[PDB]
Amino acid sequence: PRTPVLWLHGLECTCCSESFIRSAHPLAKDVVLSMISLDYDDTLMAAAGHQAEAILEEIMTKYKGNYILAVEGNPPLNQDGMSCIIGGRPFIEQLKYVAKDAKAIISWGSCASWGCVQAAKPNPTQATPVHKVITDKPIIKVPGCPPIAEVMTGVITYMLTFDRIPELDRQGRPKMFYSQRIHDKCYRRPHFDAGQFVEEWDDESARKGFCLYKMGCKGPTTYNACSTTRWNEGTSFPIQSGHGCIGCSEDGFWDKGSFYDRLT
Amino acid sequence: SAYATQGFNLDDRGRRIVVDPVTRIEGHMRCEVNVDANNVIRNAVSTGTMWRGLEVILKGRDPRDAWAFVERICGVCTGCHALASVRAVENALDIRIPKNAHLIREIMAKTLQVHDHAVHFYHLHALDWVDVMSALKADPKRTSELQQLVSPAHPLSSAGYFRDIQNRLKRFVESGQLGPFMNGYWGSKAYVLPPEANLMAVTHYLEALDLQKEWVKIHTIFGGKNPHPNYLVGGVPCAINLDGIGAASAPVNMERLSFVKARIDEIIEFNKNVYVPDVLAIGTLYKQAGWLYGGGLAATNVLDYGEYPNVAYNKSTDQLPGGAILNGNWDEVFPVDPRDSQQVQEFVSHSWYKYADESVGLHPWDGVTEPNYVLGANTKGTRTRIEQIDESAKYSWIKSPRWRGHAMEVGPLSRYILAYAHARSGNKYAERPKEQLEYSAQMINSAIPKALGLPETQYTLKQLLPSTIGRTLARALESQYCGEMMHSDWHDLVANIRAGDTATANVDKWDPATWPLQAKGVGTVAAPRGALGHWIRIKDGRIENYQCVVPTTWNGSPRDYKGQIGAFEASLMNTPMVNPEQPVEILRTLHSFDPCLACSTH
Ligand code: SF4
Ligand code: F3S
Ligand SMILES: [Cl-]
Ligand SMILES: [Mg+2]
């Protein structure tokens, strides 16, 4: 029997769900048909309304302490929680309810992990990451906006293969994907080491793939697999395509100053 | 109580039905309807059930950073907000971008159109038309025969192939863990397809799921990643070096451009061999069943800003020409000007926001976003447990955009109606959409019925297009047209590069010390779901105001000051339901707008 996943959505842009289906190894099709049972997910599920909500009750009962709760997005605490409404009630109530009997909780993306864009100043909805509301359950943070597809499916695959949470760092991120800074293995590192930098967009240095540090690249302070695993089956990553890393897997990256201001 | 608006007789005295959550959309929506004694919808209520406040968050920030913030309005229509934003800032600051940057943006935009459209149809919409359990009853041989009739050119057509797919679906269902198919509405009389049509569609659902990840690699080349590719005020960051020194390390070299063309060619094949034929066939069969409901405002009022100029910066050459049509008069298209304070305006009379004066609509340069979550006195339930929402008061996180006070439908269907009207008036740039529409009408009325042994019909485009079927058709045709267009864009890009113009960014006004101290700008995009605009005011190097009016804001809007209904609400009106507590028809029509609720509310 395949492990049930209940995939909830709070305040979000749905980038994590979209990234998930880009996975090539394994294919999202094979994950859904052969690895998990994706029993609730607003993006893809046939049932709506009362029929959708009934699924939660059924799976929680039959698979108590054996389903994975995946959360994309986050709960707002302002507006009496009704800046995110599900079934006429605050999303935070759904989150707490489904969390109670979960075997494990995955915080997908920077929204669920840290807050992401809606939590940037002045955070009008008081959007709050999952671990600050659910404080009694094991939570794995998979940050990034969105995370790499293979990172998402890689986390699921590990959990299903071993029935264990992968080794986490102090911030709750899986070390198998988040142990390295982008800057460690970035292919532009030899230019950085030789002081070869882009100074203006589309200058001669940019056309030669020089380092993007002076254009604001946050690779040196950002932990992710972007330089090595890369994006969309290793086709590129932000730096290869010519834009500095904006630090999108790091807590509070929206409020660390302009993306184009260099690290000091 | 009952009232008439826009030729619709709203009546809230019947049986109330609640659908919350509305699933197979992006984001969060609640829908309520009232049905009469005969199960016909006579009232419909669209409630956007999320808000994040991007417009508030943007205040005080650097305009050069804005695109990345607003890109995160939505990961489904990923990039279209970034495009609107850079366009708005470039408009405010009088920045002219290089030709290659324009073409790369166009290729990225058209890639999104195809990806978004095809994924919407198969993964979000198809289950409103296709009964997956019925697919299990199909004959593999007859499915092969159907595939060959529907699309001869598609190579995946053998009986053994369909048998293999059917067998895997069987094993999946027989496991008792139905996953995304759990608690579905299978077997409802609202489903009309024969088993073979269902199996063919489910097979393509799986095919599209595997292929969609390939198309977006075009975004990955030019923008680093998908979802959320990177953009740039003044051009694109993907500097070009075809084969010169450092070319291997450059964002764009010749090998990477060849790769993009390969992906484009695959898209062309998918649209013409899989997506368009499936929609024509499914549309034909539902037409034959008489399911022509869901026209709503499409029968009268449609709008788009117009996009994709043949000649850059020459709007008369738009390949999806826009404007506004009113009262179903396809003989006159009014120009739409996003700068005109009397044209695009947003009301909040029935929205959870506040203005100084809510009897008026604000143009987005003057827009205000202050939350005001409060429920009407006729609400059933409490502030945190809504049982029945009170649509006489404030009932949605979505504002109410109107054009010169008129409620409009936006989207691919609106663009195709506008394109048809332009082409009829003698606009040559709109000839392809016109050709697609006439071909489609012939296929749906005559060619596919004859092939399937069904009676022929004589619906005019005027009768066929304003319907949920028509809205679904236009999206598929638009996908095909966008693939064709970016195929041409690719050639134009490579030609320009080879001619010696390799520029990708204008940096003359990158430094804020070069900016006017005050400025306003607007950027518009023909986004996958319709007319998108971003309106910005800049003061002393910072964002003073940033207002977004997004396609699903138009379509999903609640009632305005005058009580006029928006596109979602109008489309649900006058629709019979087989079973009032199974929302099949509600989902089918709502999904035909491809609702993006995160977009609608931002
Ligand atoms: S481009 Fe960014 S991550 Fe790569 S070497 Fe330069 S600073 Fe480091
Ligand atoms: S912006 Fe995000 S996607 Fe990777 S390169 Fe930087 S962590
Ligand atoms: Cl964050
Ligand atoms: Mg807005």
Paired tokens of A14: 């749905």
Residues A130 and A70 in one domain: yes
| CA angle (B126, B131, B137) in 5-degree steps | 135
Which residue has 């956007």 as its token pair?
B48
Rounded distance from Cα A128 to ligand 2 centre (Å):
22
SS3 B29: strand
Under 8 Å between Cβ of B132 and B172: no
Residues of chain B with a following break (C to N over 2.5 Å): none
Q: What is the DSSP string of B324-393?
A: EE-TT-TT--B---TT-TTTEEEE-TTSSB--S-TTSPBPGGG----B-----TT-EEETTEEEE--TTS
Q: Do B244 and A42 touch (CB under 8 A)?
A: no
Residues A165 and A37 in one domain: yes
Cβ-defined contacts of A175-178 (< 8 Å, 24+): A177/A142, A177/A148, A177/A151, A177/A224, A177/A225, A177/A229, A178/A143, A178/A223, A178/A224, A178/A225, A178/A249
Kindly give, in sequence order, each residue whose CB lies less than 8 Å from that of residue B448, ignoring residues fewer than 6 positions away: B150, B280, B281, B284, B454
Under 8 Å between Cβ of B8 and B573: yes
Residues A184 and A107 in one domain: no
Q: Do B221 and A4 touch (CB under 8 A)?
A: no
- Indicate which atom in ligand 2 lies nearest the CA of residue A249: 7
CATH of the domain at A190: 4.10.480.10
B247: which DSSP letter? G
Which residues are B276's β-sheet partners?
Answer: none
Q: Do A9 and B27 touch (CB under 8 A)?
A: yes
Beta strand B41-48 with B29-35 is antiparallel
Side-chain-facing half-sphere of B190: CA atoms under 13 Å: 24
Put the strands of the sheet holding B518-527 in their side by side order: B518-527, B530-539, B542-549
Q: Which of A138, A153, A177 is the last residue of a domain?
A: A177
Task: Give the domain extent around A3.
Answer: 1-177
The residue type at B26: E
Distance from CA of A155 to the nearest CA of B (A): 19
Residues A147 and A23 in one domain: yes
The residue type at B283: G
Radius of gyration of chain B, Cα coordinates, nearest whole angstrom? 24
Alpha-carbon span B436 to B412, nearest angstrom: 13
| Burial bucket for residue A59 (CB in 10 Å: 0-12, 13-18, 19+) | buried
| Bond before A122 cis per omega within 30 degrees | yes
Paired tokens of B485: 């267009």
Q: Is B80 annotated as a binding residue?
A: no
Paired tokens of B515: 């900016």
Closest CA to B42 of B12, B72, B17: B12
| Bond before A143 cis per omega within 30 degrees | no
CATH of the domain at B286: 1.10.645.10
**Ligand in nearest proximity to the CA of A123:** 3
Kindly give, in sequence order, each residue whose CB lies less than 8 Å from that of residue B449, ignoring residues fewer than 6 positions away: B284, B288, B455, B456, B457
Kindly give, in sequence order, each residue whose CB lies less than 8 Å from that of residue B55, ignoring residues fewer than 6 positions away: B367, B369, B546, B547, B548, B602
User: What is the count of residue pairs from A and B with beta carbons less than 8 Å apart?
Assistant: 310
Residues A5 and A122 in one domain: yes
Kindly give, in sequence order, each residue whose CB lies less than 8 Å from that of residue A162, ignoring residues fewer than 6 positions away: none
3-state secondary structure string across A50-88: HHHHHHHHHHHHHCCCCCEEEEECECECCHHHCCEEECC
Q: Do A44 and B180 touch (CB under 8 A)?
A: yes
Cα distances (Å, whole numbers) of residue B56 to A122, B61, B521, B587, B602: 8, 10, 18, 32, 10
SS3 B433: helix
Q: Do B238 and A22 touch (CB under 8 A)?
A: no
Q: Do A19 and B227 touch (CB under 8 A)?
A: yes
Closest CA to B8 of B573, B593, B602, B578: B573
Closest CA to B441 of B457, B424, B454: B457
Paired tokens of A130: 């999952």
Phi, psi of A69 (to 5 degrees): -95, 115
Closest CA to B121 of B303, B283, B295, B286: B283
Phi, psi of A40 (to 5 degrees): -145, 125
Kindly give, in sequence order, each residue whose CB lies less than 8 Å from that of residue B224, ignoring residues fewer than 6 positions away: A231, A236, A237, A238, A239, A240, A241, A242, A243, B230, B237
Closest CA to A79 of B345, B394, B368, B46: B394
Nearest CB to A2: which of B177, B237, B507?
Answer: B177
Under 8 Å between Cβ of B510 and B233: yes
Q: Whose CA is nearest to atom 5 of ligand 1?
A: A189
Nearest CB to A41: which of B132, B180, B184?
Answer: B180
- Break chain B down into helix, strand, coil percent, rounded to 5: 45, 15, 40
Alpha-carbon span A139 to A131, nearest angstrom: 7
What determination technique applies here? X-ray
Under 8 Å between Cβ of B386 and B375: yes
Alpha-carbon span A213 to A188, nearest angstrom: 10
Alpha-carbon span A212 to A199, nearest angstrom: 8
Under 8 Å between Cβ of B79 and B532: no
Rounded distance from Cα B515 to ligand 3 centre (Å):
30
Alpha-carbon span A93 to A81, nearest angstrom: 9
Q: Which residues of B87-120 are buried (b: 16+ CB within 10 A; e: fewer)?
A: bbbbbbbebebbbbbbbbbbbbbbbbbbbbbbbb
Alpha-carbon span B580 to B549, nearest angstrom: 33
For residue A9 and ligand 1, the question of a CB distance below 6 A is answered with no
The residue type at A106: I
Under 8 Å between Cβ of B335 and B441: no
Which residues are B401's β-sheet partners?
Answer: B346
Alpha-carbon span B536 to A150, nearest angstrom: 37
For residue A216 and ligand 1, the question of a CB distance below 6 A is answered with no
For residue A245 and ligand 2, the question of a CB distance below 6 A is answered with yes
Which chain A residues contact residue B225 at CB under 8 A?
A: 226, 231-232, 236-238, 241
Q: What is the DSSP string of B119-163?
A: HIIIIIIGGGT--HHHHTT--HHHHHHHHHHH-TT-S---HHHHH
Which chain B residues contact residue A149 at CB under 8 A?
A: 213
Please give the distance of CA B97 from its chain centroid, rounded to a whole number: 27
Alpha-carbon span A124 to A118, nearest angstrom: 8
Paired tokens of B250: 């450059």
For residue A60 and ligand 1, the question of a CB distance below 6 A is answered with no
Give the orientation angle of helix B195-215 with respect to helix B99-119, to 10 degrees: 150
Task: Give the domain extent around B219.
Answer: 1-602
The residue type at A51: Q
Of A224, A228, A231, A232, the residue with max ligand 2 atoms within 8 A of its CB, to mutate for a pocket test, comes to A224
| CA angle (A249, A254, A258) in 5-degree steps | 115
Under 8 Å between Cβ of B277 and B479: no
Under 8 Å between Cβ of B168 and B202: no
Which residue has 């690895």 as its token pair?
A35
Kindly give, in sequence order, each residue whose CB lies less than 8 Å from that of residue A149, ignoring residues fewer than 6 positions away: A19, A20, A21, A22, A23, A24, A231, A232, B213
Closest CA to B124 of B475, B551, B565, B600: B475
**Nearest residue of B to residue A190 by CA position?**
B249
Paired tokens of A194: 């030789």
**What's the distance, Cα to Cα, between the start and end of chain A in Å?**
53
Q: Give the largest CA-CA distance in chain A.
A: 63
Number of domains in chain B: 1
Alpha-carbon span B150 to B35, nearest angstrom: 37
Alpha-carbon span B519 to B85, nearest angstrom: 14
Closest CA to A70 of A16, A30, A34: A16
Cα distances (Å, whole numbers) of residue B87 to B83, B137, B544: 6, 52, 17
Nearest CB to A201: which of B226, B397, B510?
Answer: B510
Cα distances (Å, whole numbers) of residue B272 to B108, B197, B449, B515: 20, 18, 20, 47
Which chain A residues contact residue B251 at CB under 8 A?
A: 209, 236, 240-242
Alpha-carbon span B122 to B307, nearest angstrom: 26
Which chain B residues contact residue A82 at CB under 8 A?
A: 373, 383-384
For residue A19 and ligand 2, the question of a CB distance below 6 A is answered with no
CATH of the domain at A102: 3.40.50.700
Q: Which helix (H) or strand (E) holds B274?
A: none
Q: Which of A177, A204, A229 is the last residue of a domain?
A: A177
**Nearest residue of B to residue A32 by CA position?**
B179
Residues A131 and A244 in one domain: no
CB atoms within 10 A of CB A15: 29
Kindly give, in sequence order, each residue whose CB lies less than 8 Å from that of residue A140, ignoring residues fewer than 6 positions away: A104, A105, A106, A107, A155, A165, A166, A168, A172, A173, A174
Distance from CA of B183 to the nearest CA of A (A): 6
Alpha-carbon span A43 to A32, nearest angstrom: 13
Residues A156 and A35 in one domain: yes
Q: Which of A145, A177, A209 is the last residue of a domain?
A: A177
Under 8 Å between Cβ of A211 and A217: yes
Rounded distance from Cα A192 to ligand 1 centre (Å):
7
Q: Which residues of A22-48 are buried (b: 16+ CB within 10 A; e: fewer)?
A: bbeeebbeebbbebbbbbbbbbbbbbb
Which residues are B30's β-sheet partners?
Answer: B47
For residue A146 and ligand 2, the question of a CB distance below 6 A is answered with no
Distance from CA of B430 to the nearest CA of A (A): 32
Closest CA to B399 of B365, B355, B357, B356: B355
Number of domains in chain A: 2
Query: From the candidates B16, B18, B23, which should be mutated to test the interface with A, based on the most A CB atoms within 10 A?
Result: B23
By residue count, chain B amounts to 602
Q: Is B599 annotated as a binding residue?
A: yes
Under 8 Å between Cβ of B25 and B2: no
